[PDB]
A paper describes a structure:
The motor protein myosin-15 is necessary for the development and maintenance of mechanosensory stereocilia, and mutations in myosin-15 cause hereditary deafness. Unconventional myosin-15 (encoded by the Myo15a gene in mouse and MYO15A in humans) is a plus-end directed molecular motor essential for stereocilia development and maintenance. Here, we present cryo–electron microscopy structures of myosin-15 bound to F-actin, providing a framework for interpreting the impacts of deafness mutations on motor activity and actin nucleation. We propose myosin-15 enhances polymerization by bridging actin protomers, regulating nucleation efficiency by modulating actin’s structural plasticity in a myosin nucleotide state–dependent manner.
To more rigorously probe whether even a minor transition accompanying ADP release occurs, which might only be discernable in more distal regions of the lever arm, we once again implemented a symmetry expansion approach for the wild-type rigor and ADP-state actomyosin-15 complexes, this time recentering the particles on the myosin motor domain to facilitate alignments capturing the distal converter and lever arm regions. This produced reconstructions with substantially improved density in the nucleotide binding pocket and lever arm region. Biochemical analysis demonstrated that the first myosin-15 IQ motif binds the regulatory light chain (RLC) rather than the essential light chain (ELC), as is canonically found in myosin-2 (4, 56), the functional implications of which remain unclear. We next examined the nucleotide binding pockets of these two states, which were well resolved at the secondary structure level by the symmetry expansion and myosin-recentering procedure. Unexpectedly, other than the clear presence of nucleotide density in the ADP state and its absence in the rigor state, we observe no discernable rearrangements in the backbone positioning of the nucleotide binding loops upon ADP release, unlike myosin-1, myosin-5, or myosin-6 (21–23). While the limited resolution in this region of the maps does not rule out more subtle side-chain level repositioning, our data imply that any major rearrangements in myosin-15’s nucleotide binding pocket accompanying ATP hydrolysis must occur concomitant with phosphate release, before strong binding on F-actin. An essentially complete lack of coupling between ADP release and lever arm repositioning strongly suggests that this step of the mechanochemical cycle is unlikely to be meaningfully mechanically gated in myosin-15. Furthermore, our Mg-ADP–bound actomyosin-15 structure reveals minimal rearrangements in the motor domain and lever arm when compared to the rigor state, providing a structural rationale for myosin-15’s high actin-binding affinity in the presence of ADP and suggesting that, unlike other high-duty ratio motors, ADP release is unlikely to be mechanically gated in myosin-15.
Numbering used by the authors:
A (entry chain B), D (entry chain A), E (entry chain C): 3 to 375
B (entry chain D): 1205 to 1734, 1749 to 1813, 1818 to 1923
C (entry chain E): 22 to 167
The structure:
């Protein structure tokens, strides 16, 4: 009885799912639940009271966009259940009671989150078996490596996990709540300097698209600020969905710099380079050599052009001058975690590490804290 | 003359006795032996035109008890069984390469065609012409044979109301690892060398094929001229048959183009060139890939991006990934293997379509299959061959146990309770789902930072306590598996490079849009006919499962073939070679199935002295079981003696023989002392009883 | 043992013994026999008296005397045991034992006998032309008497 | 049937083995058994749960180093059995049931140690014959001499054995528990004066490497202390495995001086020179002349540059002023004991002094106390 | 000229100072230097750019808390100078040039620390005389004893010092870098299991207050874990400074257990009970009896309710079954070291063991290594 196990990377801002053994996610759509707010006047078109991610993307102008997952933790459980039901039935058209499912999670997430996730996916969808895997180990699986620090930076969380030859160092795991959504909010707040006002949720997503299509990270900040406010070479234009053209100057690269300077939002934490260096310096010396030599990336918010060069420069400035820093920036930073999950779920030696229905029924939901990580 | 057709009736069954019987029958110019359901044939190296059409009427099924054991009896047996049980069946031809399997197939096809008096009128049904062609496509030189079948040839002869219809041919277990890799002192499939030897000039100037001796897919063996018996005349006759099959010159030209493309792809190298953040890959010479593109009707940039970049394509974007050198080599090897497999499938499909018979008709099966292999050093191909032979040996053991059970029931009802131990643990050790060896290998294929040492260590860990597994003592890169034919030691050198048969969808999409029609049609058909996996072992297991399902759809009955000394000596052989071939075939397991089998008249005759049996002409009703108790105090454990006579178990048999020889020794001592007493008593009469009286007369007067 | 004794042959035993073992160490000499037979006197001749004895059995003693008398032949060679031993090599009721059969049985198994012993048997064994020796008459004559 | 007997000098910190008749040990590796301590996250790489000396050297950062032999006595028997099995099979690739084996031992070791060593090497490996020889007599064999006092100072024990023309003086054998491992611990405790902290086992072995590569013994202590704290001429720099440079001053030579001044660790015993002199003065006068004239060295921890000159100066200050002291310092102080064992095991007159399997089976393990020394 | 000498116990997280001869420290305040981080908008209130411990405690929300002393060693010298100047002038209102001062230190601290401490306190404040005393001897002074092992566990270091009748055993001094600050960090990292996020420095100190007010040490760990995850009897509630109520379960006692199980943070060292037992077993037998009988405590981080009972149970399980273990837990574990320093500085026989200004000026700062300990 051959049954491919589903791999459902339900990230913080985008849901990436598919079957195990493929090379790319079958379905990719934002994790948004939309509800209309105005009053319906045409008799008959007042029945669809909830639009899942892509449909709510198509109809931004007459409804409100709410993200069920805020900064990693699942806030609204009913919306997340709706998203899971949609991505199981209306998107893959595969009954979830005949296929095992794999789910991902941030490292330092609360425990009630896992307990409720297991309870929902065992009681509602009646999945035969499920598993919860940290995203960094899946990123390392997908990168085809066994050593190095994973810098997984989605839009809800940014965490480092040092691994050496398969043995994780759980006391060096660092997690930051600064991610892509906060970059989008800073871009919204910094675009007002030129007069463009974005307040609604649809305008917030327009700003998100602007960030994806225009923003980049510079090697040096003072030099690039001088260049921007010394000419018009860095200015680029964007077209809003009503044909209105906007122009962006030094705001192009001052949006993603807050990753290295989180004092712009007012956070007391340090940049991603500093957290990576501190996580290395929480590990053993023999570990430290290979952690220096094998930095790896993942997550969407690390796709800014020029991120690798600057973080290499910063680590080299921080690390001792005699060591070799080599930062891996594969062109699949997006959904590398899903590729790793698909590789992991296709292993025949993984068949014994599921969470069978009998186990959950006999020992209760607490076994998700025992069989994971 | 010396029949001994059924060795079950002898006092005991040993491999030595079986070897002696086969030697005696071979010296009697007898090849086939009728061991109940099973048949055994030996390659004689002797051209025996046994009879002619008369042998069908001479060796039919009406007098199987008196008819000599012959190969052609199964021809009538098949019809007799299908006309009674109303169920078609299958016949397999198994044996090591060079054991006359093709000769046996030709003989059985001739006998089946000659039994209906119609083949003379409908000889145009063009059946066996392509056998040499499938041979050139499916055979290759091995270190022990210059003609070895490396694919599971399957010919299906169709019948409808006694009328012989057309035939359908298929391949099951072709080894795709041979095309790109080959051991020392062996070589690739014969047709590449045949094409390179029989190549006309116009292909030499048009196609760049002047490096016939330096292709990487061919020079790996190190010596390609050992097969010098083959020549361009084989190519000429292959082309003659190829044209006979109704193929136009365009099809042959396209086939040669694909073969030349594969050979050129063999000669492609990569360089560990620097890039943005790593060192990934770079094509050394672009003229070769350009030449490949010219003769394949496909873009060259497509091949560059399909063998250099990895494509991860989702709905909204398509991302190109640089590849490592090993990954590029694996992709190139996968492309070559899939091209060769598609060519073979296309040719088989066309041959079947030319002589396609009616549907929903009766059918008899002929299966040409591998032989058990045990070389000086063993590799992945030998492991797969051994796994397939293990499955077939399991089927053969099931058949033998079924025959034993039906015989036992035919004697008395209550011996169906006798059990039997199969080779299922070996099959589980090889390919059980959770922690099989092939499953571990498949997991190691995709696992990050994997090597041969890690795979060997994991195999050692998961199978330490398995009785069939045997960890080597020294830290050697080997392991030993206990097959039914004995211990086989494999080497884990280069397993990970023999399984990376990963073909991404972009390659198939590129080959669908080719300008030539044949390649596009083949790839479109492959995509249309296509759950699966992406390793050589997984495809081999899937094909083996399909073959097992096809076999279990019908009733299995087959025949084994053995080989004398491989120096092609007619009528001369080594008993050690016979022992090796008997062990490899699997007929030795019949002795293990016997576990007891001894007669009753032996007890009637030569087991009376112990109690000095007073009576004569004992019947079966004589106190027999307790007799032993009154002479050896052994509990009744013989199955049953009675008239149904297969009861005495081996160790008790040897105990009885030892007791018999001891009794004979004591009786001989008694006879010796009795003769000594008689001699001395003669001495006593002599010196007094016939002398003192004479002396009385001498003193007298 | 002497407790059960076949007195028919005890006289034969005592005669043979008193002729072989006398009031001396055990050695048997021409003197004793010659005296007991013709001590009166016979003129010497050499018609057939240049070779008398060549196969002496061995030494004799009174302890060995009694042991051999008790063990060797007193009530031995039972008829049933004779039939059993002779038929152990035979399946026929009549006891046809092929002469060659016994030839290999004696010269091939156990301690080896010589063809001279086989001839000794044949020189007294009644055997049919085909060589199937029988032993019913053998037992009859052996048990009957002299 | 020519069968070379194995010589396995299983010292206190390093295992040096090989065949008899060679001139150098075939295999040299630390006697360490390593076990991982963290949690494995990659499915599949959780099977190798014990790393023998060199493998555990390569992977210090994810496992704990335990020495089975502590101060000469064998503490953990299972770890020592694992080390023996490794050095027989995975290192020499020679079946131990076909070759006799020779083992070394400290002079005043307990008796249960010998009994258990013989029991293990006869029952597990089924060696045809074995022998236990004191290390000092083998050192004298290797030095090509027959008189003099052997100062065998490994990393677990430091003992003197006076021998004159092959007749040992067992009442003059002195043994100290101060050896190289205690020097390494003192170096760890004395490096904290400059701020370098070494606590783990891997850091302890880094300190051991520092000691091997930098430490030396001075002729005079007060003069060299003044020189060190009067300039920077004695300062040398070392590079840790993460490119971090450390500087060492007067700690360079104050680590190996505790051999001559064991009051630094607090021991009440006296220095090696004092123990050698007292061992001489426990011998006869005619013995004393040749013991003075023929001092010899062995063991790893006597390889410090300048040890011979200082101990010569100290013995000359102790011994009467008219006698000639000549200290032999061959350049093979390391594995001189193994060279002596190889010479001893290759003698054809040694064939009758083995411990055959029949002897052990008939008389029990106690014969190791009868046929040794 | 009667002049009381100041006693300034500048610990790792709290400064406890006062005059000699008192019974309690005059001034107690955290050793924190705070600096504002936001931008000032009101003209005039932008001058106070550095807040010393208590003022920085009052204004946590607009500034960053930095501890000058990290794990015993003094990292930032200017901040420590500011703290000393504050505690001399703005807190005691006593000119430091007219009073001798006494300072404490960890046992195995670096030497440059002492040299710079003496240089600063002689050149800046112009103190007539100063002295540096180990904290364990002062703890023994305050306990009114002369034998036993001191377990001084502040928030920067945890060290044992065995003393018998006034004669210290310097080769049995053990020092661990696991202390209260690492317990606070573990509590921060373990509170995320319930969803409470504490990242800033002010939130770190809120977690410190939680640890002080709620944490305890249990006798048995498995039994108490079962009890905690079998009922709600151990759950207690705490009120954050904004009226938000938090609930703590089994995290209440799993924070201070890492003292006995330092593998939770990943350290390879052993618990405090194991280090105490090993320090005893590094001493002489006659010493060992009285060290068993007279265990004593000090330092703040030993004030957890139930620490004495568990460490007594552990020592009794480790020590031989016939000996009597009696652990002294006086109710002044906090600032017992200061009471001992005040007793020591008030002795008239101590007047000759100061470090006079003439001595330092003539012989340089190196005399602090000669007249101390
Ligand atoms: N090409 C890009 N350039 C910059 N930012 C991107 C790009 N693609 C995605 N992102 C950002 O990454 C965030 C989430 O991406 P991803 O990591 O794929 O999903 P998740 O965070 O759910 O794992 C989005 O909020 C988006 O702003
Ligand atoms: N070149 C060297 N200089 C100083 N010390 C050394 C040197 N080589 C080895 N050592 C010390 O010798 C100790 C053990 O060496 P050795 O005597 O060869 O092994 P064993 O003590 O097992 O016989 C090690 O702990 C090491 O510190
Ligand atoms: N009542 C208490 N319960 C638990 N921990 C405490 C208590 N009082 C103080 N601490 C801890 O002790 C640490 C320092 O206290 P203390 O030893 O007095 O200062 P120092 O470590 O500077 O000598 C603080 O970090 C605090 O966490
Ligand atoms: Mg992600």
């Amino acid at each position: 009885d051959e049954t491919t196990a589903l791999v459902c990377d339900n990230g913080s801002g985008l849901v990436k799912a598919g079957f195990a053994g493929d090379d790319a996610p079958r379905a990719v759509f934002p994790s948004i639940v939309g509800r209309p707010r105005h009053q319906g006047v045409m008799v008959g078109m007042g029945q669809k009271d909830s639009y899942v991610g892509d449909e709510a993307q198509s109809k931004r102008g007459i409804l409100t966009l709410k993200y069920p997952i805020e900064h990693g933790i699942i806030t609204n459980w009913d919306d997340m259940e709706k998203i899971w039901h949609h991505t199981f039935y209306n998107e893959l058209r595969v009954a979830p009671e005949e296929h095992p499912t794999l789910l991902t999670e941030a490292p330092l997430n609360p425990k009630a989150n896992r307990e409720k996730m297991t309870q929902i996916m065992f009681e509602t969808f009646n999945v035969p078996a499920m598993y919860v895997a940290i995203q960094a180990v899946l990123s390392l699986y997908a990168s085809g490596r066994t050593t190095g620090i994973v810098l997984d930076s989605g839009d809800g969380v940014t965490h480092n996990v040092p691994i050496y030859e398969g043995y994780a160092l759980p006391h060096a795991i660092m997690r930051l709540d600064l991610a892509g959504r906060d970059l989008t909010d800073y871009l919204m707040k910094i675009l007002t300097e030129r007069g463009y006002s974005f307040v609604t949720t649809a305008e917030r997503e327009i700003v998100r698209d602007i960030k994806e299509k225009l923003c980049y990270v510079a090697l040096d900040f003072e030099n690039e600020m001088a260049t921007a406010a010394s000419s018009s070479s860095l200015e680029k234009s964007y077209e809003l969905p009503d044909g209105q053209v906007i122009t962006i100057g030094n705001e192009r690269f001052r949006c993603p710099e807050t990753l290295f300077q989180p004092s712009f939002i007012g956070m007391e934490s340090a940049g991603i380079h500093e957290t990576t260096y501190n996580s290395i310096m929480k590990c053993d010396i023999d570990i430290r050599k290979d952690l220096y030599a094998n930095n790896v990336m993942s997550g969407g918010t690390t796709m800014y052009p020029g991120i690798a060069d600057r973080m290499q420069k910063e680590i080299t400035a921080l690390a001792p001058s005699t060591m070799k820093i080599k930062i891996i920036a594969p062109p699949e930073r997006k959904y590398s975690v899903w590729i790793g999950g698909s590789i992991l779920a296709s292993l025949s030696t993984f068949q014994q590490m599921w969470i069978t229905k009998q186990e959950y029924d006999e020992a209760g939901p607490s076994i998700v804290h025992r069989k994971c990580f | 003359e010396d029949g001994v057709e059924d060795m079950t009736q002898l006092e005991d069954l040993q491999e030595t006795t079986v070897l002696a019987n086969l030697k005696t029958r071979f010296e009697r110019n007898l090849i086939y032996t009728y061991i109940g359901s099973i048949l055994v044939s030996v390659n004689p190296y002797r051209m025996f035109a046994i009879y002619g059409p008369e042998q069908v009427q001479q060796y039919s099924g009406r007098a199987l008890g008196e008819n000599p054991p012959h190969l052609f009896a199964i021809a009538n047996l098949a019809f007799a069984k299908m006309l009674d049980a109303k169920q078609n069946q299958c016949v397999i031809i198994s044996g090591e390469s060079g054991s006359g399997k093709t000769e046996a197939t030709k003989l059985i096809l001739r006998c089946l065609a000659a039994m209906n008096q119609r083949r003379d009128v409908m000889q145009q049904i063009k059946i066996l012409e392509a056998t040499p062609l499938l041979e050139a496509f499916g055979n290759a030189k091995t270190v022990r044979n210059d003609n070895s079948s490396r694919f599971g040839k399957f010919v299906e002869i169709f019948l409808e109301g006694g009328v012989i219809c057309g035939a359908i041919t298929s391949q099951y277990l072709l080894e795709k690892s041979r095309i790109v890799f080959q051991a020392k002192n062996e070589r690739n499939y014969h047709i590449f060398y045949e094409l390179l030897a029989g190549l006309p000039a116009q292909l030499r100037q048009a196609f760049s094929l002047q490096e016939a001796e330096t292709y990487y897919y061919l020079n790996q063996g190190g010596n390609c001229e050992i097969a010098g018996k083959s020549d361009a005349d084989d190519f000429r006759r292959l082309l003659a048959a190829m044209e006979v099959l109704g193929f136009t010159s365009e099809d042959q030209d396209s086939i040669f183009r694909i073969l030349a493309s594969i050979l050129h792809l063999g000669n492609v190298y990569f360089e560990k060139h620097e890039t943005d953040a790593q060192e990934v890959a770079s094509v050394v010479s672009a003229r070769e890939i350009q030449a490949v593109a010219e003769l394949l009707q496909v873009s060259p940039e497509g091949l560059q991006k399909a063998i250099t970049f990895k494509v991860t394509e989702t709905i909204r974007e398509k991302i190109f990934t640089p590849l490592t050198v090993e990954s590029a080599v694996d992709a190139r090897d996968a492309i070559a293997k899939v091209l060769y497999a598609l060519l073979f499938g296309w040719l088989i499909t066309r041959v079947n379509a030319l002589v396609s018979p009616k549907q929903d008709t009766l059918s008899i099966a002929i299966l040409d299959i591998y032989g058990f292999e045990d070389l000086s050093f063993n590799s992945f191909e030998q492991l797969c061959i051994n796994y397939a032979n293990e499955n077939l040996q399991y089927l053969f053991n099931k058949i033998v146990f079924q025959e034993e059970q039906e015989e036992y029931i035919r004697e008395q009802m209550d011996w169906r309770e006798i059990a039997f131990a199969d080779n299922q643990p070996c099959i589980n050790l090889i390919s059980l789902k959770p922690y099989g060896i092939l499953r571990i290998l498949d997991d190691q294929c995709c696992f990050p930072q994997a090597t041969d040492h890690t795979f060997l260590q994991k195999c050692h860990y998961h199978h330490g306590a398995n009785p069939l597994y045997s960890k080597p003592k020294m830290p050697l890169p080997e392991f030993t598996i206990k097959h039914y034919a004995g211990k086989v030691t494999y080497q884990v050198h280069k397993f990970l490079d023999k399984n990376h048969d990963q073909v991404r969808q972009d390659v198939l999409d590129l080959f669908v849009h080719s300008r030539t029609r044949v390649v596009a049609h083949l790839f479109s058909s492959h995509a249309a006919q296509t759950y699966k996996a992406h390793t050589v072992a997984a495809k081999f297991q899937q094909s083996l499962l399909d073959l097992v399902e096809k076999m279990e759809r019908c009733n299995p009955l087959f025949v084994r073939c053995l080989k004398p000394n491989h120096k092609k000596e007619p009528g001369l052989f080594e008993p050690d070679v016979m022992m090796a071939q008997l062990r490899y075939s699997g007929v030795l397991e019949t002795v293990r199935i016997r576990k007891v089998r001894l007669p009753f008249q032996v007890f009637i005759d030569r087991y009376r002295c112990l109690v000095a049996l007073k009576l004569n002409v004992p019947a079966d009703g004589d106190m027999c079981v307790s007799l032993l108790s009154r002479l050896c105090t052994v509990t009744p454990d013989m199955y049953r003696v009675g008239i149904s006579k297969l009861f005495l178990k081996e160790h008790l048999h040897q105990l009885l023989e030892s007791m018999r020889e001891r009794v004979q020794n004591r009786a001989a001592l008694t006879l010796q002392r009795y003769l000594r007493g008689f001699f001395i008593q003669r001495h006593f009469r002599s010196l007094r009883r016939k002398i003192i009286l004479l002396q009385s007369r001498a003193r007298g007067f | 043992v002497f407790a059960m004794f076949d007195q028919s042959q005890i006289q034969e035993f005592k005669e043979a013994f008193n002729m072989i073992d006398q009031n001396r160490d055990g050695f048997i000499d021409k003197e004793d026999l010659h005296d007991m037979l013709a001590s009166l006197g016979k003129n010497p001749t050499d018609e057939y008296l240049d070779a008398m004895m060549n196969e002496a059995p061995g030494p004799i003693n009174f302890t060995m005397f009694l042991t051999m008398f008790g063990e060797k032949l007193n009530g031995t060679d039972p008829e049933d045991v004779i039939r059993n031993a002779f038929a152990c090599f035979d399946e026929e009721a009549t006891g046809f034992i092929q002469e060659d059969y016994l030839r290999e049985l004696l010269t091939t198994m156990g301690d080896r006998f010589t063809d001279e012993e086989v001839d000794e048997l044949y020189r007294e064994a009644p055997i049919d032309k085909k060589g199937n020796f029988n032993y019913i008459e053998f037992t009859r004559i052996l048990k009957h008497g002299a």
